Amino acid sequence: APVLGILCGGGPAPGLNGVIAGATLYALRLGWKVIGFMEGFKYLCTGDVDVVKAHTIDLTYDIVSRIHFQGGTIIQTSRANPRKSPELQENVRKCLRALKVRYFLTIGGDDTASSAVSVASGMNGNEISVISCPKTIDNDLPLPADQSTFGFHTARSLGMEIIRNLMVDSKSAPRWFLVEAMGRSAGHLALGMAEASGAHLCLIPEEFKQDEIEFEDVVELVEATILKRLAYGKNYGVCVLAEGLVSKMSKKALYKLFGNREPPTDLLDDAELARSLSEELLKRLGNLGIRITPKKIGYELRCADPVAFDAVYTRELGYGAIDAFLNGHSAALIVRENGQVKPVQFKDLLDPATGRVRTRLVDVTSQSFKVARVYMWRMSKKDYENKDLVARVAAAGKMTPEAFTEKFAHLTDVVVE
Amino acid sequence: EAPVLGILCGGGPAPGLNGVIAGATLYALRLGWKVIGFMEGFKYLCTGDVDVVKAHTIDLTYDIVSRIHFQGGTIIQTSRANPRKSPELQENVRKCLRALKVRYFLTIGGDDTASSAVSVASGMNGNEISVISCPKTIDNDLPLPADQSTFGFHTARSLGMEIIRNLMVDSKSAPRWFLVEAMGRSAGHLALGMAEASGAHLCLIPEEFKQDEIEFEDVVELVEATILKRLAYGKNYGVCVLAEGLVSKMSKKALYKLFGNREPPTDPHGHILLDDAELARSLSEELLKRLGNLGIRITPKKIGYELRCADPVAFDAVYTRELGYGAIDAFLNGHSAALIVRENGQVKPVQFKDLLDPATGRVRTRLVDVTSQSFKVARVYMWRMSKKDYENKDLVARVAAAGKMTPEAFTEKFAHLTDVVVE
Amino acid sequence: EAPVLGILCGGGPAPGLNGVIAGATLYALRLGWKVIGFMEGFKYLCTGDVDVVKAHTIDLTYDIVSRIHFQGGTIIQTSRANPRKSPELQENVRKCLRALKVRYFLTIGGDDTASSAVSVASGMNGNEISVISCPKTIDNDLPLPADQSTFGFHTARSLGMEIIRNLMVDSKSAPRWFLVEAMGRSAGHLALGMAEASGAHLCLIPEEFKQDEIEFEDVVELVEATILKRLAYGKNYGVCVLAEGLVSKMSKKALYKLFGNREPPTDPHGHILLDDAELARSLSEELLKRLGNLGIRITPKKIGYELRCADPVAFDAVYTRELGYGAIDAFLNGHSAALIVRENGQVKPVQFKDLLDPATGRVRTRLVDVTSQSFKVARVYMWRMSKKDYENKDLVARVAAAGKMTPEAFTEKFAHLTDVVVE
Amino acid sequence: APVLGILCGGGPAPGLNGVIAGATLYALRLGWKVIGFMEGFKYLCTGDVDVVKAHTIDLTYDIVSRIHFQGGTIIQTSRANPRKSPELQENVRKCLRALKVRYFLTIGGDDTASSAVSVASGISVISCPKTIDNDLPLPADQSTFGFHTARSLGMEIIRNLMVDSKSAPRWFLVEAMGRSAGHLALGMAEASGAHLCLIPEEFKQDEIEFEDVVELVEATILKRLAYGKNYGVCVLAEGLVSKMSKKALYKLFGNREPPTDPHGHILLDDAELARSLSEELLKRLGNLGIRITPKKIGYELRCADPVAFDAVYTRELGYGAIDAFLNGHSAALIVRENGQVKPVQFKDLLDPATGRVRTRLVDVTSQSFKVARVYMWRMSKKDYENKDLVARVAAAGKMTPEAFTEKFAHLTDVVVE
Numbered sequence A: 001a002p003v004l005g006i007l008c009g010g011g012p013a014p015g016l017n018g019v020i021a022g023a024t025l026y027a028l029r030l031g032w033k034v035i036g037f038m039e040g041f042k043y044l045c046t047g048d049v050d051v052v053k054a055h056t057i058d059l060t061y062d063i064v065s066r067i068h069f070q071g072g073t074i075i076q077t078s079r080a081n082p083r084k085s086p087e088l089q090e091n092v093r094k095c096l097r098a099l100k101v102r103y104f105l106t107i108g109g110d111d112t113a114s115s116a117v118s119v120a121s122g123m124n125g126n127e128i129s130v131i132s133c134p135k136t137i138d139n140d141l142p143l144p145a146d147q148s149t150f151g152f153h154t155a156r157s158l159g160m161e162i163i164r165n166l167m168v169d170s171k172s173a174p175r176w177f178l179v180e181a182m183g184r185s186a187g188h189l190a191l192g193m194a195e196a197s198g199a200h201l202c203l204i205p206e207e208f209k210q211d212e213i214e215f216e217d218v219v220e221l222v223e224a225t226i227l228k229r230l231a232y233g234k235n236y237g238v239c240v241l242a243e244g245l246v247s248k249m250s251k252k253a254l255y256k257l258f259g260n261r262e263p264p265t266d267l268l269d270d271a272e273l274a275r276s277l278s279e280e281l282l283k284r285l286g287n288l289g290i291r292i293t294p295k296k297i298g299y300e301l302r303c304a305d306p307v308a309f310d311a312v313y314t315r316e317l318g319y320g321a322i323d324a325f326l327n328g329h330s331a332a333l334i335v336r337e338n339g340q341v342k343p344v345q346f347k348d349l350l351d352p353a354t355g356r357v358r359t360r361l362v363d364v365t366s367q368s369f370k371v372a373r374v375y376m377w378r379m380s381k382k383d384y385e386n387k388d389l390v391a392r393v394a395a396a397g398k399m400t401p402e403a404f405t406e407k408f409a410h411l412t413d414v415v416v417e
Numbered sequence B, C: 001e002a003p004v005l006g007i008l009c010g011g012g013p014a015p016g017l018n019g020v021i022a023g024a025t026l027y028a029l030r031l032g033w034k035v036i037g038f039m040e041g042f043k044y045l046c047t048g049d050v051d052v053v054k055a056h057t058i059d060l061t062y063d064i065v066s067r068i069h070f071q072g073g074t075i076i077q078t079s080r081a082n083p084r085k086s087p088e089l090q091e092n093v094r095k096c097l098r099a100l101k102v103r104y105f106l107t108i109g110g111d112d113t114a115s116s117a118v119s120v121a122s123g124m125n126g127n128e129i130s131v132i133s134c135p136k137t138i139d140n141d142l143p144l145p146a147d148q149s150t151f152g153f154h155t156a157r158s159l160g161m162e163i164i165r166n167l168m169v170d171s172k173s174a175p176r177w178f179l180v181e182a183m184g185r186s187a188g189h190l191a192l193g194m195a196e197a198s199g200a201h202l203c204l205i206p207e208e209f210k211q212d213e214i215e216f217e218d219v220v221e222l223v224e225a226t227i228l229k230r231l232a233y234g235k236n237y238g239v240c241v242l243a244e245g246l247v248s249k250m251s252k253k254a255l256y257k258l259f260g261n262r263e264p265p266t267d268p269h270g271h272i273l274l275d276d277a278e279l280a281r282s283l284s285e286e287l288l289k290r291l292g293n294l295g296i297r298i299t300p301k302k303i304g305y306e307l308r309c310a311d312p313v314a315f316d317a318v319y320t321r322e323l324g325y326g327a328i329d330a331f332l333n334g335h336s337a338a339l340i341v342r343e344n345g346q347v348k349p350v351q352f353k354d355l356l357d358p359a360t361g362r363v364r365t366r367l368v369d370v371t372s373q374s375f376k377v378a379r380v381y382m383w384r385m386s387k388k389d390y391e392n393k394d395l396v397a398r399v400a401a402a403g404k405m406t407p408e409a410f411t412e413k414f415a416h417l418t419d420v421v422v423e
Numbered sequence D: 001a002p003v004l005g006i007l008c009g010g011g012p013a014p015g016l017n018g019v020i021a022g023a024t025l026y027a028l029r030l031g032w033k034v035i036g037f038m039e040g041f042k043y044l045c046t047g048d049v050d051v052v053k054a055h056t057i058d059l060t061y062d063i064v065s066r067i068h069f070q071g072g073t074i075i076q077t078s079r080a081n082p083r084k085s086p087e088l089q090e091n092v093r094k095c096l097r098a099l100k101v102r103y104f105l106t107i108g109g110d111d112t113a114s115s116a117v118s119v120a121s122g123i124s125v126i127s128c129p130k131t132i133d134n135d136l137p138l139p140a141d142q143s144t145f146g147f148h149t150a151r152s153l154g155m156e157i158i159r160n161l162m163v164d165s166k167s168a169p170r171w172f173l174v175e176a177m178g179r180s181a182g183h184l185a186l187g188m189a190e191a192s193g194a195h196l197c198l199i200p201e202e203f204k205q206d207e208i209e210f211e212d213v214v215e216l217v218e219a220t221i222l223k224r225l226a227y228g229k230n231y232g233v234c235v236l237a238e239g240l241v242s243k244m245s246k247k248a249l250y251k252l253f254g255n256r257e258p259p260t261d262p263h264g265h266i267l268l269d270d271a272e273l274a275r276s277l278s279e280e281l282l283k284r285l286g287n288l289g290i291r292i293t294p295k296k297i298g299y300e301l302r303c304a305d306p307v308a309f310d311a312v313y314t315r316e317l318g319y320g321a322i323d324a325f326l327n328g329h330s331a332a333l334i335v336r337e338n339g340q341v342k343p344v345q346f347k348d349l350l351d352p353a354t355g356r357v358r359t360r361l362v363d364v365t366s367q368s369f370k371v372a373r374v375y376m377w378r379m380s381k382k383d384y385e386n387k388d389l390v391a392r393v394a395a396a397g398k399m400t401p402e403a404f405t406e407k408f409a410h411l412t413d414v415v416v417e
């Protein structure tokens, strides 16, 4: 019987086991033998077939029959990448031929899919067929607008529940939380958690008009929201910050971000966006009775058990991968569009300028973004022109109306309105 | 004086009602509007007594609604009181709305609530009052573009999956079959969604039956064949999900057997009381007569009322926030006798009459599309005997032996089921 | 060779079974022991065929058990297969245990499982095998020091609270009464725990009835009085929790009415089949006849099987970890024919005889102490008519008027209820 | 009718609303009038009766009938403390007399109870034990309300991190907020099966050294690595910081002078224990294939909806507070022992050396602690004396057995065994 081998690459997202089980169960009904490589390409890169065998398992019915309930991945994952070296690509081809892998399914992000196609491009199309399922919790695949990537619904819903606890705690014991949503690629996750939880502010890189963000502008955007709520008798709230703000900051802004220090270098992971903003804002607003606390939301989302939407999603994706194998497809990506799972050739999704799959960002001109903005607390252009409002907010910050306009009014040209 | 927006809920609750109330109220308050909420739908507006109505209306202020987007249920309650049947009741509602000076009238409910709102508007000046309705249903049976959900459906399906998960662990830990009955007779979206997400071994919905009337025997044998096939592979346990809509598709003879070979109950006016039917219980009793000797135990379990007021999941929180906003936007844009729906990520008003099926006069009901690829995929991961399976003699011999019967007896009893449901 | 520890589960699952298996296995593996798990309790050990037993036994290795403490259910399954009835079955078990060289034998189950393990041990030499059982019950009916819980009870009570919460929101959003029936006929701990935690408006357990046999009419009137008192305060909705144990205290006459004025169903041996009773459904029908004119809707709802394999809450995870460790410690100290329980924060072995009530021959049943302060506090927050309430003429006039009857008719019908339940 | 006034003090814990509703509902059945002071003692401390009145609300049936389902506190809370100044103590008594409060119920931890008695020594005062840290001096094995809820949610968060650390091999250093005791850290760790837990109670010496904490985590990571596991989860009570010596704190803050408030006390809130340990350990172990990530668990626990144990607990506590008022008790704390709620005089709970409420810590000599320790990965004394094991772990750390013993063996005198 033909051999299907499956591996996972990149950082996990809820529903990985759903894809493994959808593909495995269907393949077993077809009579296929299914094996799973542990930790992605890590051991296939060595080329030693004995080492690979020690880190491959038989994906049987009993193993996968109920993993659709479970977050994580039973075959683990790694960022080991064979595409960088032609020796590594040939080591992967050597082990795949030794195991008689007829069908090769990878579940991972762009780097994982590119590794799978590079292994196939130097391999006979009759002995091996390669299919990849695009993975990302960030919702940044170029699907039709409003259609989600798998795992995003689970991450957003758990993020809403965590922020709910922080909303009740900030009101019960007046304080501001600056929640930092991990993920620098796009603002879908930060804005989704914020809108669902009714957070009082959300800042994503997509809403900044200029190409480079300044540290001062971010501080003042949060400062204005705190003062406006304070003018309405509320010295507490929650502000959600997409970590992608850091990757859009200028060189000078990053210098201030790291404590007026030289930014580390080989390193945006060492940055503490929420922490730095909390310190600066306490300098400016602590005298007003405002306390501010940072809080990161990230790793606890990646392996939460999938919600029903993602369970159905990944079951259909696993099926579609096997169907693509049956219909002779190769070097294709299994995506779901308009309720239909279908294979799409890797190059059809690539952005020519980058060489990787195109990144779908938050559309800040859409009506959905304007609706989310409506339920946030913030000073719009019209608000700065409302003199009664400006007088109350300035007085809340213990400053003259002219000083408030002098400091904050320019922010209407920093972010879309 | 600021314009008055009045809000009410009609029909059975669904997760996210408070999200629609809060989206409309918060945005309206930023516009300077005064917002009031009628308690229990049309119940008190139908009396015509303005004193009674005011005793059951409340001021929807910022503090009241500022955080109800986290909460299931509806803070202004709901009712199935329906003024559309009587012009006296329709005029009583108009009388109280004029007394309260309602400029904008938002109803949140199902089909009957929207039809009541439009009937109240047709005898009302479009300049004094504007009426908008937001369609509600956990059953996912609104005619939205295919595969796009109605609000509340995601929450109900996800909680249904988690309950069935516990029943899947229990059925395997202590081998047994659960016959889960998903409440709701309108369509099979909810039953099939819970079943596919939870990996249930079978799902039966009215949509998959080819004939216009289902027979009680056919339903019993469809579950029986699944139990026997599982038993042939060494598994004397499982979970089968049943849409309650199977009952409303059954023939007269089938309903007689369903109610215990007794006369089906009827209301004073002469309507069969299908709520008193216990589909999962009756099927469990019959199947225990046939399969108990094989070591099979079967237990029914209903999933229904515990879903209606669960706290909304994030998808429904975003959904209902956008719907509440879209209702206020529709009022601002001069729309009336319209329904706020979301299509391809865009909330927009759609005239009530544009959504009516001309042959019926009511809104068209979207059922599960059993020809779609989604249904075919869900069916793949169920345990069942397909057309191809009945022609496989090796498999048929294994299943027949599991049921302690000859292969010829197995084909005689179960093979006809391929003409009962689409394949 | 390393000593062999064999583990099995019997009876119905409870949250934390996997915690006991993993606590015992991990500690034993650090001692160098070999650990095996029998699938489905005594089911296959009863055959006596060593090949069949091996086909349904697995090696409990570190990898198998390292993370099952998060999971409800039992990875080695369970059954009520019971060798205590036959020494042919007991000797079939003894033959397979000797063949597998089981030095230590841990069973996790109820009375039937522990009694089976000791009967198998009494006909073996104390040098070749040592037997320890861990008592299991989700009902909280072990004779531990008062208010100290059995493992699994916290998980079941907490999930029951969450289900009832959704029903409390739904009953208020769409005015109606739910009659929630907490499955389990042994005691009232589970029903009372869910009700008090959820703030349910009434809870009825068999323990609070003074007489030895309950009458169907009295139960109907106790719920009726609560509904009428709530109605007198403007509340035509609520939730009432009923322990299924009420059925097992009902008289022959009460059971006749319960089953529809029919002869109660019976098994082949002539014993009554109380599982076929639908307590919540029957009370809902009767109460709708009496109160439907008042605008009251009543709906039954069962809570049972979805609790048994929910993932354990932290209290039960720590609990079952300590029990599994304590079982290995008991083996190390030479104990046998002992039960591993936790008392006053200390896991200890307790000889079978200390827990047996001579009248039953099985472990003593700890019921709810209706004289305790905890029960009196729970009763305070319920809606009900106390002795003093019946003496309050103003209150009786409001409640009777709520039921559309005279104060004398209300007192004549309901006042006797003060002698039916403890006050 | 008699007036019952209720307030909450300290950081929120799940079940606060349960106490308010238990006391209020029962008091309303007695015909009492119930009021709630917003934000604890904050406004009572001012002495301005006008300000206090603006921040009190009427606790009616409709307000409290269903708040037992809700985390947080509807009357908010604060750490405002009148015991520090006798002028403030007289301000609190002045406002209570002005409002004619006959019964005064405070809901909080040790700091709140000690504040209530200073007002009481010169109206009836009762306090209800609140703390997610479980550090009130209740009878042994009896939890404070909120502890069950916080421990159970912490277990669920750590579960997601356990699946993620195994799916994508890495170590998480979870920092459990709370410096008073180790009940919360040990509870979350034992329930979740975390591979290590470090609490201040297990250190023998009065002052902890930064190097020893690093090496205790290092030894666990190396022992796991010797058994084929390059991943895990370690839970750390942040109270380790409050036991560190002056030198340890210097290294903790980046070899800088520890930050300080105007009075000269160290600002331990600004410390990042988990991050600092993660940086040091990655320098030492990154070459072995070890990744390490810090993660804080704290503020998201404080206002989770109460679990059933805490709902029943706080209902009985609220009832017991009213019963104590009816029976003439004052200056007492409502505790539950053997299923019986009873008042216990404040002075019986004071530690004679301190004059403040006694703090109950984890008993590291108990059998419960020894059992939790059994399921942790660590090197005991006997392990360091096991020559075969020491050689396996040292080889895992790429060092000689002699180098391993020289570095780690002294740790048996650092923590209890």
Ligand SMILES: Nc1ncnc2c1ncn2[C@@H]1O[C@H](COP(=O)(O)OP(=O)(O)OP(=O)(O)O)[C@@H](O)[C@H]1O
Pocket: A228, A232, A374, A375, A376, A377, A378, A379, A383, A386, A389, B029, B030, B031, B032, B062
């Ligand atoms: N930035 C904001 N985000 C959300 N709600 C707001 C915001 N600003 C005000 N609100 C809400 O608007 C409602 C109406 O407020 P108000 O009567 O002061 O006039 P407004 O039209 O909102 O003011 P302005 O146009 O100056 O922002 C209040 O309930 C307030 O909570």
Ligand SMILES: Nc1ncnc2c1ncn2[C@@H]1O[C@H](COP(=O)(O)OP(=O)(O)OP(=O)(O)O)[C@@H](O)[C@H]1O
Pocket: A028, A029, A030, A031, A061, B229, B233, B380, B381, B382, B383, B384, B385, B392, B394, B395
């Ligand atoms: N109805 C079903 N639903 C889901 N999985 C099934 C079903 N029937 C069989 N399977 C699974 O399909 C896999 C293959 O089964 P099996 O060996 O019987 O099929 P086969 O190789 O096609 O042979 P045969 O033609 O004899 O059926 C097994 O793991 C079985 O569990």
Ligand SMILES: Nc1ncnc2c1ncn2[C@@H]1O[C@H](COP(=O)(O)OP(=O)(O)OP(=O)(O)O)[C@@H](O)[C@H]1O
Pocket: C029, C030, C031, C032, C062, D223, D227, D374, D375, D376, D377, D378, D379, D386
């Ligand atoms: N520190 C530890 N904490 C928990 N389990 C452990 C620890 N060290 C080893 N184990 C587990 O102990 C089991 C037995 O391992 P092994 O045979 O090496 O003996 P050991 O437990 O180290 O004891 P001994 O010192 O008596 O040889 C293995 O499954 C291993 O996972």
Ligand SMILES: Nc1ncnc2c1ncn2[C@@H]1O[C@H](COP(=O)(O)O)[C@@H](O)[C@H]1O
Pocket: C233, C380, C381, C382, C383, C384, C385, D028, D029, D061
């Ligand atoms: N049986 C009961 N259980 C709980 N609360 C009650 C009960 N009876 C009355 N109450 C409440 O007690 C308060 C005083 O009632 P009354 O003395 O009748 O005005 C009101 O808030 C009532 O709603």
Ligand SMILES: [Cl-]
Pocket: A010, A011, A012, D168
């Ligand atoms: Cl990663």
Ligand SMILES: [Cl-]
Pocket: A182, A296, A297, A298, A299, A300, D295
């Ligand atoms: Cl994180």
Ligand SMILES: [Cl-]
Pocket: B011, B012, B013, C174
């Ligand atoms: Cl309804």
Ligand SMILES: [Cl-]
Pocket: B012
């Ligand atoms: Cl309906």
Ligand SMILES: [Cl-]
Pocket: B174, C011, C012, C013
């Ligand atoms: Cl069972």
Ligand SMILES: [Cl-]
Pocket: A173, D010, D011, D012
């Ligand atoms: Cl605080």
Ligand SMILES: [Cl-]
Pocket: D361, D362, D363, D364, D366, D368
């Ligand atoms: Cl302790």
